[PDB]
Chain length 208, copies 5
């Protein structure tokens, strides 16, 4: 006999959780990590500077309100994102809504760590010039919390321990040369607070 | 120990939320301020007089029924628009529904001030003539309450509007020459009362 | 101190509207007036006899179960259509589902009179022949109740007036010559009863 | 002073609605009739053997769990299909999901007879060869229950006979030569039971 | 009089299904079998290495929490998937969301065995090179659980012989030369556990 099973954990999470309440820990912002693992580049237009790509948006953060004693029960459960709070990230230069290609489930660990990694197809406005050259083009995608400023949400790249083209389609007409990520904190007109973002630089080119 | 946290504030807002009730203060109309920050100009057809544009629609208004004492609690919260009343604005010359590219969350201040600023991609019917000339074309976009007349909702350009081209994409095939906002008050045959609107004149041209 | 405010009125409507129940008074059918205000004519094709049109579909009818004494209270409110019964109108020759470009709110008057006027973009299969001539083309659009027969819903064209181009976009590649309506009552092979429709005739042509 | 009105009948149907429960009368299958009233033929590609069609899918069956004494009550009511059980019909050769152009309402008679007649636009994979000839093409469309076998649902062509092109648009680029039906009973490798379908053959040709 | 009817069964399922809870047996992984029956090949593009496929994704697994005594009651029922737990399968190389063409119902047998077989149209990124040769092309489709690792979900190519062109449309411009399945267990850089998938190799070519 155990202390709890998945049904108990999920039941408790659904019964509470509060999807609309940001899990700030006292006076600290929620530390969100986000990185883009590119899977494909389906269309590129050097005249209009538009690209159509697919990527896994690995997203992580902690939500202590989800934690549970796992000394005698499962250590993790897959949870519908509709049942928990998730960062309100947006790509500033996206020109289409994200088309989520995978089941919208996050993975919650008994300590409150949450991983959400949907595969997404989305179009963007970025620098496509040079794509047809050896040095390639460098398309920058900026992602960050849409409505939470720096005192509520911070964004940093996730860690990386693999090739930038690790999961990139070998059948794409393009190939990846380099993928880098840099964090930023920007203040805009509408509001007095600063908003953080991660800038992902996709350096790619048309294959020979 | 505080008086309340985000969970409590959001709970109170959700529980008393009358999304379908315009927050008129007595008999005064709800004063709505609107201004467009252009992000991109994607499709332009001078033959059909049609254009595709991406813009942030900064919308502000006061809803006193949302106010709370923040002396010992958070001063603001991000709230899903489905839990609040929002102006029923519509672009009169739009020929496509608004494609909202950002999380649909409004920011609510403890005094009742609300800010909703979605990034929208929408197609419009306007004058594209001259877009390929030095003077460029001037496309006018009209926005106002669809069902609330002047005595229930007033719409005015945002007083501070200096960032109209601040976020415009340097990668667009077009460039902005000027953005002007103006207010109107029209009476249409269908009905007796007058409906206010804001007219945004986008003077732009094709690079080259 | 008044008798009631919008919050009270909308609360009562939401609690008792009965959206699935046609508001027939005794045994008299619900008199639904339908009037199309043409806003734009977009992608016309004389080869396939298809056309894209944008119009305000002014729809009016009365629902006595919505009336309230507005002696000392608002005499009108905007209500989400999901909270009211609305006629099940359908465009017989439409070849695409209606794209509603406006907030789906109807205006309900204290005496029970209801007005719903969505701006719609929809494609139709009609006669485009002669669109390039001085006499132009005459595209007929048929609209009527899909499941309520003549004894339950009566559709009547509102003899609004002339000036059918009052709200027609000056930027369209086409122009409106004239708009006329007429009432039909058809018995289909599926069923014994008769279903009525208003047939709007749109005579238009490409601007010379 | 009647026995009941529409509000009472629709209240009882909604309250005891078992939308996910096939209403088999004891151990007898549910007898479903279906005939397709072709309204239009919009896209025809003889290269890829694909066609875009608009048709009224006249569907009828009996659900005795809906009946009510109509001595002094309405003889019938229109009911949102989401509140009733409907056959899980699927076109085996469709290559796009059905686009329902009409309000999703079914008509229920006091005896329990039900009629659901959506107007549908759908793309199909069929023989388009000889569409440009005088003999025309014969595109066969197969429709049957997707998850209910012959002992639970039987499917038969509607006995209702009428001009094939009876409601076919006169503005289509094509015209109908003839429409014949055929009832099949097939056994598929996945499952041990037999599944029924109605095969509708659309003999049409392009206009000269 | 029986022990139970479909109404009772579906009611118990609706009340106790727990759709967000994977039905792991005691502590073993849920054995999921997957088999793709190809129905059609459309929109092939050898330049971009993309193809549109229509297939029945035969999916089976066991959920003993659904079992019931059918000695005096129906042995099976069709259940809306929203009322059941279903494997969170995803096609790794799909570049469009799956378009489900059939009613989203699964078949649940009284012993607890579940079958879900939606017909799906979806675009893929794969090797289309050689489609115009006698050897044809070989497009591999990889499908596995997105958030459940090998210890929670195992995926296996159904063990059974079946003509690959059994249900393939005779009107497609392409034909199937052969179809083979391969099982895999993969560890992704994001996570420590291994995730299983089945890779289906579709060898097809353009018909002469
Ligand atoms: N995160 C961003 N990007 C541009 C402006 N902004 C901040 C912001 C703040 C509040 C609301 Cl409701 N919307 C946006
Ligand atoms: N804002 C506008 N534009 C055209 C007509 N109108 C006013 C209006 C009034 C009432 C209802 Cl239900 N809908 C629209
Ligand atoms: N309004 C029309 N047009 C064609 C047939 N019809 C009448 C009708 C009657 C009942 C149901 Cl459920 N659906 C449609
Ligand atoms: N319509 C038919 N005939 C044979 C198979 N099939 C499709 C089908 C049957 C049962 C389930 Cl759960 N899913 C899909
Ligand atoms: N099955 C796959 N493919 C890529 C990563 N992954 C595993 C995985 C783990 C956790 C969450 Cl929330 N999402 C996906
Ligand atoms: Na454990
Ligand atoms: Na300005």
């Amino acid at each position: 006999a155990e202390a709890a099973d998945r049904a108990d954990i999920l039941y408790n999470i659904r019964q509470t959780s509060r999807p609309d309440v940001i899990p700030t820990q006292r006076d600290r912002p929620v530390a969100v990590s986000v990185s883009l693992k590119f899977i494909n580049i389906l269309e590129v237009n050097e005249i209009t500077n538009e690209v159509d790509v697919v990527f896994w948006q690995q997203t992580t953060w902690s939500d202590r309100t989800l934690a549970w004693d796992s000394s005698h029960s499962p250590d993790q459960v897959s949870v519908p994102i509709s049942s928990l709070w998730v960062p309100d990230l947006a790509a500033y230069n996206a020109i289409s809504k994200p088309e989520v290609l995978t089941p919208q489930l996050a993975r919650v660990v008994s300590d409150g760590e949450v991983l959400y990694m949907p595969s997404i197809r989305q179009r963007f406005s970025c620098d496509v010039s040079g794509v047809d050259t050896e040095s390639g083009a460098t398309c920058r995608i900026k992602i960050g919390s849409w409505t939470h400023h720096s005192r509520e949400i911070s964004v940093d790249p996730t860690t990386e321990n693999s090739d930038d083209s690790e999961y990139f389609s070998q059948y794409s007409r393009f190939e990846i040369l380099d993928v880098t990520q840099k964090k930023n904190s920007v203040t805009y007109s509408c509001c007095p607070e600063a908003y953080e973002d991660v800038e992902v630089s996709l350096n790619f080119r048309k294959k020979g």
